[PDB]
Design a protein around this nucleic acid. Structure first.
Lengths: 380, 49, 1341
RNA sequence: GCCGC
């Protein structure tokens, strides 16, 4: 290693019998319930506040309906008239705009708490937020005529709109778990692309299991011999770990030899690898190989980190033989990305171009591929 | 400080025959300081146990 | 000659009085010698991995007709130096390459071979290398490895103090320790029977181990006891005479010699009667038959008539048995000594204890006893006994163990086998038996002749061996299944176990730890440190009072001052300044030989036993010009004692008084006027001082500051110094003198001075040059000084003007009153450097990118970020400012219409990517100092990174082109000389480049030989320089092979200044510590008649009860030194002529009472006198050695020469009222240190934070925002007060009441102040834990 | 490992 990162901060409970214990953390709802406790509320008001705080998502939005909140209470004199009042009180909390019904509600609540002398407060308070929101989503060229205002003033009214916070309530959120990957199966580039299995720790577990179980057995302080108590348990542990490691290594080897085309040259050279294809390769059932490849990750210099991605069973009735949709999806992404400023990319036109390239795909099949991670560039 | 340091010895509890005839205003010898280190260490170890 | 260039600049006035026979050692050679004897190869197997390789190899598979032949090894060149390793966070190591050959032996032909494959060397593991200072950079740290003091292998005899059975019975035991293997014990029960404890198992009698060596009881009886012959012929029944043994006995009957009475019956036994009997030559004499009744037969006499015989050895005889033996024809009967005067009944009683009389019976007995499992089959026991002892692999005494074993048994030979033989156990048992009988004595376990030292090299060798043995095991198996095609690398090279063991030892070990980097002296003390703990050592609680005591053999080996205080007292020690280690591993100290009545300058090193044997004189004993003692009777140490002896009686003399003081203690002036236990505190506190903004030399020293400063490796020392050519704050270039040079390529010296950098304790290490320009430099001179160093002298504090008086309660107890002038002048101000790091790793959502743009963050936080998104170099950051901008992707594949709307109004990401950026932690104010972006191979280089690369390569070519320029200048000079020799155009030739087209050809010889060779050398030099520069450039820009997950690492360094404050802790070097109580304005401090105020006010009450007299003497001597400096400064102000200034300096230097230091300004240059005077303008740096230094009279005459009061006390005035204090107040100069204890690092307050998941109780400790623990004694105090509500509020809510906490917080915010207490969650956890057992516990109503 | 006992 040319350079090594510094060790990440870790801790463990010392001078405490239940080792490592734990640590409490603050969340969005925990921080909202803290504010509920410190504001003057009645018993029923506190109950409603807890009910609507429980329904706040991580983004801080209100996933459940107000009418559903009223239904949940199931109490007389708890109609939506007072549920709305408690809801507004909660919305005016430290993450301003939290617990909002929708995007319009966030912006309307956020704009309420301002100097009231903002240069374009009233220009964007309701005219842009509470009305013609879809126009602001679009270019809003006609919005200038709709609001009877010049484009110049709107050019900064939308600037203020963007200055307003998009999704309030995810700022207080911490985010300590980075969900990093150890990449149990590193693979490298050689004259034939060899692959290896790291983090096995089987010899490490073997040595520790020896020094503990076989160590106690070999220690002649105890009468007799502990040849069956733990000596024939460490062997089972080692055998289980080695069997799992061998199965994983063999399956990953089959995947690599089949998908070497992906790693070589361009990435989008995936074969539609079905579970049976590797099942016959290892002479083993597909279900056992499948369970194995569910969350195992490989480290690639350029390739994606995920065994399941290679399966792509997408014969797609391609012209010569078969193909894979994931490669077809990458092709569609690249084609749509590199187009004219108009960028038609019509699902009929895109399908015709793909068929000319040799991929006989239906017109609607390309549309589902595009809608998976993109939007039509004014193709309508 | 101004008179003899006196008779002292604590290797096992006995007493060294020749005492320290020097105070702290005058210097101690290497031998006298080495002798006094025994009692110093004994006291310091007694304190921490 | 008399003084070096660096020492002529400022000469310390030594007070000496005793010449030095030898100088002081490096003090870090130990570590260096050990590791050099480790990595370095040896023609024999004496030292180096070579010994381990020969111990393991050759290896062959069972019945494999296959061998591994080993031939040599080689260590590779490291890919990074110490600096790059330390900045990158990697380990500084070297690749290990070993050449080995595989030979296949013929199966058909016995002892014949068919194949022999000698392929090239193979690579296994990486060996960490120690730096020139004795440190191991592993994972970018320092990690000194501490030496260990353990018991040497051998044989030892003890007596367990004779208080076990409360009967007053002393029980003697013997013990054998090998280097590796099982142990052996011999013990005595209160019944006096030999017992053997093998490997700390159950007690077993010695007869079975005796018989397992094929020893019959009869044979054993003869060896165990001396036999006496009883002859019964013709009913006479005569007795053989042994007068020597017959010392104490009662004559049961008249004893007659040759028919004449010699000793009457019951006649008193007298040494005179025995002598008279021995004088008369007498043959065998008759005795009463009844006496033999108590005797015990030794042999087993056989009856010639029938096979029946009395073989019952260890048994007595009966009267009827006499008739049986007479009838059988037994004329002579063999019986053992049966005497108890000095000898005693042993072995035979143990024989009566156990009846096993066969080798097989003993073997099966020991196999069953030591292994209580399956019974053996005549083979398990036979194998086990060989495995226990005398097995080449399982059991081994070292060469030290064999030497000690032979020495303890008084054997002429020193060398021997590593395993014990049959005779060794016999000799040990015989010696143990004799010890009880009276001959011999028990040895001391704390004697330094029984305690050995292991350094880093030996431990590294041991760990390498375990990796070898581990790898060798796996190697054996694959030879069985290995075809001829198989190659060594394919013969289970197994580089994994060797490297794993090596890194396990070097990284995670008890004796491996960070080196203290507060000061150079602290690093030196850590490097020279001896520990009794560790793997082979003793645990803390397992230690006792006697182990932690000062032993008389500690004299010149370990200082009796420096040691930790609380738990580790007496278990961690330091080497004395002159101590050295034996090849076996025993501490040594040097002494001067004494021949006749005159000491000789020849020096011998003696171990504890060697010193004890001779009478050693004291260091402070006066001598004559010829070397003869001035006084007949001299003080000496003979055998752990001290008394008066004649000068001739002395055989050796102490080389120096310091011989008994550690290097750290050697730095306490007037140490002998300080209490030893108190001095311990001063020596310990000296290593906690932090370097300040500017180093200041001690005005009062001991003369050891230069050795510590230079030997620590902190300064820059001229390795081959010539003349200084270029100087800068970061570089020094020296033009080496031509008197010594390496032929070819000439050469110059380049030194890259270290700038501000983090230390292990977050302090700053910086180097500043001491030379100006064109200055001559000799070998070993100091060019630049590091942290806390001044002109090559250790300078770890500052010189304060101190008054000793009480001041209105502001120095009550140990408080210190400091003036504001100290704060204004930035004395005691330190720089602290911190390191923060940010790493980007690929995630399931996707790669983690580092960018300047950040969602949901205002422009204000991005003001200080670069285009990449990193704080600008030199930015000042506080609070929670953003250092590196990083965004992690989120997981989303269902585009909700609102999400599409959010993406429509806002950016494409719509702030979906979360914010995980490096922000400054709260309470941390720092200025951007250094950014260290590292990039993965293949990924796009960071925009900031290319700038770092450009700086790197620019510096590389800048420091590389100098040698090329010098070489090309030399070549041009040679060409110019050649063209001058013929066809010289002078300035015309010099104007045209390329030597004016090489000056055409001129003569044929010049064109063919001179010009052609010059052009060839020019082209070769240019090509070599270009290739070297290209190689350096290619090395600079390379992809960083990082961890598979890791994508990019960015490191940020912050620098802060710590202002001096009252909550801060200060100390002198005499054990006088205290915290600041107040920072006083300058007009309030006491001042003298000239209007000069003091800087510090110290309490006089701290001196007399602490016996810190060195404080006062140091203060008086500092006053004298500053007075002399003041006189010199006044003379320099008025620009007096050099002659009288030189005269006054000379008068000050040669003052004293017969001091050894002789300095004359007569041989001093006139300019050098001026420079020296300006250097000692502040004060004269006096030096008083440890036990041989200045006296009161000398201090007084120095005070007189400085025109100061002789008592050391002056008149002082109150700064607030102007009134004179009644009594005179002592005023002078003292060296004060600032320790690493600060209120900022020790101020914490919590109202409410996070809590442990278990017990629902707040966390503990700062850096975690914890609460203070209310322990058991606090609760006892609250109970004693009767404060029930305070205790309930501490025990319940505000601690573990989950609902009570929130209710109390709400009430306090509402201004109610009502507890409303509930039940703690810890008690619920306890109830659940108890119920989880089989016990039902409930709360009744 | 260190600090206050």
């Amino acid at each position: 290693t040319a350079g090594t990162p510094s060790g990440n901060g870790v801790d463990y409970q010392d001078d405490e019998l239940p080792v490592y214990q734990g640590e409490t953390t603050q969340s969005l709802q925990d921080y909202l319930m803290w504010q509920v406790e410190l504001t003057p509320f009645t018993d029923t008001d506190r109950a409603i506040a807890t009910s609507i705080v429980d329904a706040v998502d991580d983004t801080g939005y209100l996933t459940i309906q107000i009418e559903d909140i009223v239904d949940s209470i199931g109490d007389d004199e708890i109609g939506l008239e007072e549920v709305e009042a408690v809801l507004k009180r909660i919305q005016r909390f430290d993450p301003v705009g939290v617990a909002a019904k929708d995007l319009r509600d966030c912006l309307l609540i956020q704009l309420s708490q301002f100097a009231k002398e903002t240069p374009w407060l009233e220009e964007a308070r309701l005219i842009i937020s509470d009305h013609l929101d879809l126009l602001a989503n679009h270019d809003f060229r006609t919005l200038m005529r709709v609001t009877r205002l010049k484009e110049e003033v709107l050019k900064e009214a939308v600037n203020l709109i963007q200055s307003l916070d998009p999704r309030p309530g995810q700022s207080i959120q911490t985010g300590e778990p980075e969900y990093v990957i150890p990449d149990v199966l590193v693979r490298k580039v050689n004259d034939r692309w060899v692959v290896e299995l790291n983090s096995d720790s089987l010899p490490r577990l073997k040595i520790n299991q020896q020094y503990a179980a076989m160590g106690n057995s070999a220690r002649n302080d105890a009468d007799g011999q502990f040849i069956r108590s733990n000596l024939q348990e460490a062997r089972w542990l080692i055998k289980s770990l080695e069997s799992a490691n061998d199965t994983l290594l063999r399956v990953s080897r089959c995947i690599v030899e089949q998908q070497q085309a992906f790693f070589e040259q361009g990435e989008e050279y995936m074969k539609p690898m079905v579970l049976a294809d590797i099942a016959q390769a290892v002479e083993m059932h597909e279900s056992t190989i499948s369970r194995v490849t569910t969350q195992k990750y490989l480290h690639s210099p350029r390739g994606i980190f995920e065994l399941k991605y290679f399966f792509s069973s997408h014969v797609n009735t391609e012209g010569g033989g078969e193909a894979s949709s994931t490669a077809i999806r990458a092709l569609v992404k690249k084609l749509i990305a590199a187009e004219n400023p108009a960028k038609p990319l019509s699902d009929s036109k895109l399908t015709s171009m793909l068929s000319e390239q040799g991929i006989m795909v239906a017109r609607r099949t390309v549309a589902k591929y595009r809608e998976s991670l993109s939007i039509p560039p004014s193709n309508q | 400080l101004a008179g003899m340091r006196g008779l002292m010895a604590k290797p096992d509890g006995s007493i060294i025959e020749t005492p320290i005839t020097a105070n702290f205003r005058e210097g101690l010898n290497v031998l006298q300081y080495f002798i006094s280190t025994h009692g110093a260490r004994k006291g310091l170890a007694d304190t921490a146990l | 000659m008399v003084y070096s260039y660096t020492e002529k600049k400022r000469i310390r006035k030594d007070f000496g009085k005793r010449p030095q026979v030898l100088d002081v050692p490096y003090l870090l050679s130990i570590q260096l010698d050990s590791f050099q004897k480790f990595i370095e190869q040896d023609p024999e197997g004496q030292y180096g991995l070579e010994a381990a390789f020969r111990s393991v190899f050759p290896i062959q598979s069972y019945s494999g007709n296959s061998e591994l032949q080993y031939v040599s090894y080689r260590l590779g060149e490291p890919v990074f130096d110490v600096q790059e390793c330390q900045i990158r966070g990697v380990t500084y190591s070297a690749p290990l390459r070993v050449k080995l050959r595989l030979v296949i032996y013929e199966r058909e032909a016995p002892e014949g071979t068919v194949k022999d494959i000698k392929e090239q060397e193979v690579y296994m593991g990486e060996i960490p290398l120690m730096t020139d200072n004795g440190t191991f950079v592993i994972n970018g740290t320092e990690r000194v490895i501490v030496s260990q003091l353990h018991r040497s292998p051998g044989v030892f005899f003890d007596s367990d103090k004779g208080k076990t059975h409360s009967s007053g019975k002393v029980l003697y035991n013997a013990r054998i320790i090998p280097y590796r293997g099982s142990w052996l014990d011999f013990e005595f029960d209160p019944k006096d029977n030999l017992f053997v404890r093998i490997d700390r198992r159950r007690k077993l009698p010695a007869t079975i181990i005796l018989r397992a060596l094929n020893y019959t009881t009869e044979q054993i009886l003869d060896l165990f006891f001396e036999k006496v012959i009883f002859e019964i012929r013709d009913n006479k029944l005569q007795m053989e005479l042994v007068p020597e043994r017959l010392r104490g006995e009662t004559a049961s009957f008249d004893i007659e010699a040759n028919g004449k009475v010699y000793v009457e019956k019951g006649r008193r036994i007298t040494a005179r009667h025995i002598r008279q009997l021995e004088k008369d030559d007498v043959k065998l004499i008759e005795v009463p038959v009844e006496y033999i009744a108590g005797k015990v037969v030794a042999k087993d006499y056989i009856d010639e008539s029938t096979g029946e015989l009395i073989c019952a050895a260890n048994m007595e005889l009966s009267l009827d048995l006499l008739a049986k033996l007479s009838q059988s024809g037994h004329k002579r009967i063999e019986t053992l000594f049966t005497n108890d005067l000095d000898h005693g009944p042993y072995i035979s009683e143990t024989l009566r204890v156990d009846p096993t009389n066969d080798r097989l019976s003993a073997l099966v007995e020991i196999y069953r006893m030591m292994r209580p499992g399956e019974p053996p089959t005549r083979e398990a026991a036979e194998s086990l006994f060989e495995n226990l002892f005398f097995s080449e692999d399982r059991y081994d005494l070292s060469a030290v163990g064999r030497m000690k074993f032979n020495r303890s048994l008084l054997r002429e030979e020193i060398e021997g086998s590593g395993i014990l033989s049959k005779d060794d156990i016999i000799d040990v048992m015989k010696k143990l038996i004799d010890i009880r009988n009276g001959k011999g004595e028990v040895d001391d376990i704390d004697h330094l002749g029984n305690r050995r030292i292991r350094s880093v090299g030996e431990m590294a060798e041991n760990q390498f061996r375990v990796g070898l043995v581990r790898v060798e095991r796996a190697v054996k198996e694959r030879l069985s299944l290995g075809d001829l095609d198989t190659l060594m690398p394919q013969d289970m090279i197994n580089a994994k176990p060797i490297s794993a063991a090596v890194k396990e030892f070097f990284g995670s070990s008890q004796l491996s730890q960070f080196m203290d980097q507060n000061n150079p002296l602290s690093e030196i003390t850590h490097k020279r440190r001896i520990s009794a703990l560790g793997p082979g050592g003793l645990t803390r609680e397992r230690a006792g009072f006697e182990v932690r005591d000062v032993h008389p053999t500690h004299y010149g080996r370990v200082c009796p001052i420096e040691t930790p205080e609380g738990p580790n007292i007496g278990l961690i020690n330091s080497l004395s300044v002159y101590a050295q280690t034996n090849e076996y591993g025993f501490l040594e100290t040097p002494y001067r030989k004494v021949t006749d009545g005159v000491v000789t300058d020849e020096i011998h090193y003696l171990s504890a036993i060697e010193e004890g044997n001779y009478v050693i004189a004291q260091a402070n004993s006066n001598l004559d010009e010829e070397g003869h003692f001035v006084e007949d009777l001299v003080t000496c140490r003979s055998k752990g004692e001290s008394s008066l002896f004649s000068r001739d009686q002395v055989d050796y003399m102490d080389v120096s008084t310091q011989q008994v003081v550690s290097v750290g203690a050697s730095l306490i002036p007037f140490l002998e006027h300080d209490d030893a236990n108190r001095a311990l505190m001063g020596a310990n506190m000296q290593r906690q001082a932090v370097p300040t903004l500017r180093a200041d030399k001690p005005l009062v020293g001991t003369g050891m500051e230069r050795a510590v400063a230079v030997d620590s490796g902190v300064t820059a020392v001229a390795k081959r110094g010539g003349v200084v050519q270029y100087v800068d704050a970061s570089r020094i270039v020296i033009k080496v003198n031509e008197d010594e040079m390496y032929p070819g390529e000439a050469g110059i010296d380049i030194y890259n001075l270290t700038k501000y950098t983090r230390s292990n304790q977050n302090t700053c290490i910086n180097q500043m040059p001491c030379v100006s320009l064109g200055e001559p430099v000799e070998r070993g001179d100091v060019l630049a000084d590091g942290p806390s160093t001044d002109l090559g002298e250790l300078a770890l504090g500052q010189n304060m003007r101190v008054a000793f008086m009480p001041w209105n309660g502001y120095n009550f107890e140990d408080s210190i009153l400091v003036s504001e002038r100290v704060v204004q002048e930035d004395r005691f101000t330190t720089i602290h450097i911190q390191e923060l790091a940010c790493v980007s790793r690929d995630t399931k959502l996707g790669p983690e990118e580092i960018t300047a743009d950040i969602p949901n963050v205002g422009e204000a936080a991005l003001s200080k970020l670069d285009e990449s998104g990193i704080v600008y170099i030199g930015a000042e950051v506080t609070g929670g400012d953003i250092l590196v901008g990083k965004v992690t992707p989120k997981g989303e594949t269902q585009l909700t219409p609102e999400e599409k709307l959010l993406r429509a109004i806002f950016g494409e990401k719509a702030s979906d990517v979360k914010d995980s950026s490096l922000r400054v932690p709260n309470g941390v104010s720092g200025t951007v100092i250094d950014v260290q972006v590292f990039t993965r191979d293949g990924v796009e280089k960071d925009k900031r990174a290319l700038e770092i690369e450009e700086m790197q390569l620019k510096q590389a070519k800048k420091d590389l082109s100098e040698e090329l320029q010098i070489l090309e200048a030399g070549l041009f000079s040679r060409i110019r000389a050649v063209l001058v020799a013929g066809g010289v155009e002078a300035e015309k030739l010099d104007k045209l480049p390329r030597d004016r087209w090489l000056e055409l050809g001129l003569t044929d010889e010049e064109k063919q030989n001179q010009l052609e060779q010059l052009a060839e050398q020019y082209d070769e030099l240019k090509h070599e320089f270009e290739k070297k520069l290209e190689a350096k450039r290619r090395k600079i820009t390379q992809g960083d092979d990082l961890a598979p997950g890791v994508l990019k690492i960015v490191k940020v360094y912050l620098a802060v200044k710590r202002r001096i404050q009252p909550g801060d802790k200060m100390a002198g070097r005499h054990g006088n510590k205290g915290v600041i109580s107040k920072i006083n304005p300058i007009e309030d401090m006491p001042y003298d008649e000239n209007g000069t105020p003091v800087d510090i006010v110290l309490n006089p009450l701290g001196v007399p009860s602490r016996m810190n007299i060195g404080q006062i003497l140091e203060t008086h001597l500092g006053m004298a030194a500053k007075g002399i400096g003041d006189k010199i400064n006044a003379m320099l102000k008025q620009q007096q002529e050099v002659a009288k200034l030189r005269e006054f300096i000379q008068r000050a230097y040669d003052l004293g009472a017969d001091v050894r230091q002789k300095v004359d300004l007569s041989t001093f240059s006139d300019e050098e006198v001026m420079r020296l005077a300006e250097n000692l303008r502040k004060g004269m740096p006096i030096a008083t050695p440890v036990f041989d230094g200045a006296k009161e009279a000398e201090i007084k005459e120095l005070l007189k020469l400085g025109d100061l009061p002789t008592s050391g006390q002056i008149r002082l005035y109150d700064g607030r009222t102007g009134e004179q204090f009644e009594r005179p107040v002592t005023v002078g100069y003292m060296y004060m240190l600032k320790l690493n204890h600060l209120v900022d690092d020790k101020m914490h307050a919590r109202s409410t934070g996070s809590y442990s998941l278990v017990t629902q109780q707040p966390l503990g400790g700062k850096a975690q925002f914890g609460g203070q623990r209310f322990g058991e004694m606090e609760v006892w105090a609250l109970e004693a007060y009767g404060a029930a509500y305070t205790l309930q509020e501490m025990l319940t809510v505000k601690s573990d009441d989950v609902n009570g906490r929130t209710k109390m917080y709400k009430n306090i915010v509402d201004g109610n102040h009502q507890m409303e207490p509930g039940m703690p969650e810890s008690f619920n956890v306890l109830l659940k834990e108890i119920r989880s057992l089989g016990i039902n516990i409930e709360l009744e109503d």
